[PDB]
Design a protein around this motif. Structure first.
Motif, short mmCIF file in Angstrom:
data_model
loop_
_atom_site.label_atom_id
_atom_site.label_comp_id
_atom_site.label_asym_id
_atom_site.label_seq_id
_atom_site.Cartn_x
_atom_site.Cartn_y
_atom_site.Cartn_z
N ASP A 1 92.24 -15.96 -20.83
CA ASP A 1 92.40 -17.50 -20.87
C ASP A 1 90.84 -17.88 -21.32
OD1 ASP A 1 90.58 -17.04 -18.43
OD2 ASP A 1 92.28 -17.42 -17.29
N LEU A 2 90.60 -19.10 -21.27
CA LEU A 2 88.87 -19.59 -21.69
C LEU A 2 88.08 -18.94 -21.01
CD1 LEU A 2 87.83 -20.94 -23.94
CD2 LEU A 2 87.72 -22.93 -22.59
N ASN A 3 88.34 -18.58 -19.64
CA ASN A 3 87.42 -17.78 -18.83
C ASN A 3 86.96 -16.39 -19.06
OD1 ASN A 3 86.53 -19.46 -16.73
ND2 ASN A 3 88.20 -19.21 -15.19
N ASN A 4 87.98 -15.74 -19.49
CA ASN A 4 87.84 -14.30 -20.09
C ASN A 4 86.90 -14.31 -21.25
OD1 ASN A 4 91.29 -13.66 -19.52
ND2 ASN A 4 89.39 -13.37 -18.22
N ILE A 5 86.78 -15.49 -21.91
CA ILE A 5 86.17 -15.69 -23.26
C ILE A 5 84.74 -16.12 -22.92
CG2 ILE A 5 86.14 -16.62 -25.46
CD1 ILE A 5 88.57 -14.87 -23.79
N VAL A 6 84.30 -17.29 -22.39
CA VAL A 6 83.02 -17.57 -22.16
C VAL A 6 82.00 -16.42 -21.55
CG1 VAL A 6 83.11 -18.55 -19.75
CG2 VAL A 6 81.56 -19.56 -21.35
N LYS A 7 83.07 -15.47 -20.78
CA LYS A 7 82.43 -14.36 -20.42
C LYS A 7 82.50 -13.07 -21.24
CE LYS A 7 80.06 -14.87 -18.72
NZ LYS A 7 78.90 -15.51 -18.91
N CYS A 8 82.11 -12.84 -22.29
CA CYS A 8 82.13 -11.85 -23.16
C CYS A 8 81.69 -12.18 -24.55
CB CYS A 8 83.40 -11.00 -23.30
SG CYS A 8 84.45 -12.04 -24.26
N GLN A 9 80.95 -13.14 -24.77
CA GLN A 9 80.48 -13.58 -25.83
C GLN A 9 79.60 -15.10 -25.94
OE1 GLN A 9 83.41 -14.04 -29.21
NE2 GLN A 9 84.82 -13.51 -27.68
N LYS A 10 78.65 -15.15 -26.59
CA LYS A 10 77.98 -16.54 -26.79
C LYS A 10 78.85 -16.96 -28.12
CE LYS A 10 77.10 -17.60 -24.37
NZ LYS A 10 77.77 -17.72 -23.17
N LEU A 11 79.88 -17.92 -27.92
CA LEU A 11 80.73 -18.52 -28.68
C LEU A 11 79.70 -19.05 -29.77
CD1 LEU A 11 83.26 -20.20 -26.43
CD2 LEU A 11 82.97 -17.76 -27.21
N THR A 12 79.93 -19.14 -31.19
CA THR A 12 79.30 -19.75 -32.18
C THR A 12 79.65 -21.37 -32.05
OG1 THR A 12 81.07 -19.35 -33.81
CG2 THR A 12 79.33 -17.73 -33.71
N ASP A 13 78.94 -22.02 -32.70
CA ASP A 13 79.14 -23.58 -32.74
C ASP A 13 80.70 -23.54 -33.34
OD1 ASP A 13 78.60 -26.34 -32.38
OD2 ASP A 13 78.42 -26.76 -34.36
N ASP A 14 80.97 -23.06 -34.44
CA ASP A 14 82.35 -22.98 -35.01
C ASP A 14 83.33 -22.49 -34.04
OD1 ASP A 14 80.05 -22.00 -36.88
OD2 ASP A 14 80.89 -23.24 -38.18
N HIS A 15 83.00 -21.65 -33.06
CA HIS A 15 83.98 -21.24 -32.17
C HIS A 15 84.20 -22.46 -31.18
CE1 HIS A 15 83.27 -16.87 -32.94
NE2 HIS A 15 84.44 -17.08 -33.56
N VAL A 16 83.19 -23.04 -30.86
CA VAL A 16 83.43 -24.29 -30.11
C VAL A 16 84.05 -25.35 -30.48
CG1 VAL A 16 82.33 -25.94 -28.08
CG2 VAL A 16 81.39 -23.57 -28.75
#
Ligand SMILES: *c1c(OC)c(OC)cc2nc(NC(=O)c3csc(COc4ccc(F)cc4)n3)sc12
Length: 350
Positions: free
Chosen positions: A109-124
């Protein structure tokens, strides 16, 4: 047309499921029931199989069972969890007691994600684009999720996102008290019971999620309802008299007016470094007056999403008849409605 079922003791209850589902392993339990992961040999998919707990225990329970089923059978969209299958081992309504719901197994889930990378702007961009795409669909059926938060968003390895769960009618007062992510994404009008709410609560949640993707930090991590309100008001400003008129409870207005008035903050100075277009969108999502918030359909056409926006690939939902939400029926009657929905299920052609 009945497949053959087989039995298995599993968690603490006897699971009876069609033989197509193999290698069941429990993944979670709770108040709603119990979930097992399984392999659907007929489709090749990894699936979650949820056995409902006490589905027809009370009138409230029975109606909530029917609501979940109606809601899941209805959702047919790339960015929304759909129903792969629903079954009961019973052969008639007389022996009907258990409902099993089968959906896509989602890992991250999105939690697992915001916690293992600094999303690029294109990711956001791409993640929020998909949320709003799913929300445009959901809202076009006059469905309100009401419980959008990172843990309710599945994201596979290709960054594809699905909205999960849906606020059915859960949320105990104790589960909403204190420093808990269960309340951090909720619009203030719902949080404090200001007024009759509508689908614009979901856009507030998207604003909180987006901000967290951009910063990696919770936007409004209040320690309680009132702390969280002060955090909100410090960013978006205290209400003006126009929004105050719309707050139904004399007491909420009275408390609101006790606060020192505060101007809305400069979002470019709060979200340092962020894409000016992300900042602009956040300013339109995180509006106190829900009447004035951007809608999902309007946000999809915002320049922040120009990379992904396709007006011919942002479908709306078939009509969704929720008149049952106003009906008072007996336990037996909801149960029979549910049985009809179980046996009428048509697998997706996917
Ligand atoms: C997006 C994303 O959300 C913004 C997150 O957080 C969950 C992670 C993430 N990782 C990415 N990297 C790749 O997708 C990648 C690596 S090699 C490649 C090309 O070929 C493959 C290899 C294996 C596959 F399963 C698919 C494609 N892509 S993007 C993203």
């Amino acid at each position: 047309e009945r497949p053959t079922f087989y039995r298995q003791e599993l968690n603490k209850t006897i699971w009876e499921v069609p033989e197509r589902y193999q290698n069941l392993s429990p993944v979670g339990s709770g108040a709603y029931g119990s979930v097992c992961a399984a392999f659907d040999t007929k489709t090749g998919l990894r699936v979650a199989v949820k056995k409902l707990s006490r589905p027809f225990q009370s009138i409230i329970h029975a109606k909530r069972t029917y609501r979940e089923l109606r809601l899941l059978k209805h959702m047919k969209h790339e960015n929304v969890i759909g129903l792969l299958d629903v079954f009961t081992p019973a052969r008639s309504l007389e022996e009907f007691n258990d409902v099993y719901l089968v959906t896509h197994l989602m890992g991250a889930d999105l939690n697992n994600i915001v916690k293992c990378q600094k999303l690029t702007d294109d990711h956001v961009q791409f993640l929020i684009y998909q949320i709003l795409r799913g929300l445009k669909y959901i809202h076009s059926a006059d469905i309100i999720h009401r419980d959008l938060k990172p843990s309710n968003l599945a994201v596979n390895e290709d960054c594809e996102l699905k909205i999960l769960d849906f606020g059915l009618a859960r949320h105990t007062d104790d589960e909403m008290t204190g420093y808990v992510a269960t309340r951090w994404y909720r619009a203030p009008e719902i949080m404090l019971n200001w007024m009759h709410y509508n689908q614009t609560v979901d856009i507030w949640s998207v604003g909180c999620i987006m901000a967290e993707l951009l910063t990696g930090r919770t936007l409004f991590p209040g320690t309680d309802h009132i702390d969280q309100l002060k955090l909100i008001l410090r960013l978006v400003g205290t209400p003006g008299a126009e929004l105050l008129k719309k707050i139904s409870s004399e007491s909420a207005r009275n408390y609101i007016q006790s606060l020192t008035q505060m101007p809305k903050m400069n979002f470019a100075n709060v979200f340092i470094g962020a894409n000016p277009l992300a900042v602009d969108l956040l300013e339109k999502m995180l509006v106190l007056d829900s009447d004035k918030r951007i809608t999902a359909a309007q946000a999809l056409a915002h320049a922040y999403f120009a990379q992904y926006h396709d007006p011919d690939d942002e479908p709306v939902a078939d009509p969704y008849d929720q008149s049952f939400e106003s009906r008072d029926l007996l336990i037996d009657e909801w149960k029979s409605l549910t049985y009809d929905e179980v046996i009428s299920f048509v697998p997706p052609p996917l």
